[PDB]
């Protein structure tokens, strides 16, 4: 019975690993997007941009 319980626990831990990995990938994409947005915000602060390029 303990062996079967360990099988169940290993399966559940593996499922949790997969969910964690998927969320980690999505968060990685989100942080890359945030870095690009930071670059854009820094670029706009330049005082040579009149109005249109802003």
């Amino acid at each position: 019975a303990q062996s079967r319980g360990l099988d169940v626990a290993m399966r559940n831990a593996n499922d949790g690993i997969s969910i964690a990995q998927t969320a980690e990938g999505a968060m990685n994409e989100s942080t890359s997007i945030l870095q690009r947005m930071r670059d854009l915000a820094l670029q706009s602060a330049n005082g040579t941009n009149s109005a249109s390029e802003r």
Binding site: L42, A45, N46, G47, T48, S50, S52
Partner: protein
């Protein structure tokens, strides 16, 4: 009178220069530039002030 006429021509030339020099549509020596902020460092705050007088 001839010298005055040439001086008047040069004066209108000075006005044209003041009103014409533009960095891609952004007038510089007209007087609208005033003061601008140049973001020259990583993160916010690290910037300088450029002041152009007509």
């Amino acid at each position: 009178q001839a010298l005055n006429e040439e001086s008047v021509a040069l004066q209108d030339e000075l006005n044209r220069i003041a009103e014409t020099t533009s960095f891609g549509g952004r007038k510089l020596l007209n007087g609208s530039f005033g003061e601008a902020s140049f973001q020259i460092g990583s993160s916010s705050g690290e910037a300088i002030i450029m002041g152009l007088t007509s």
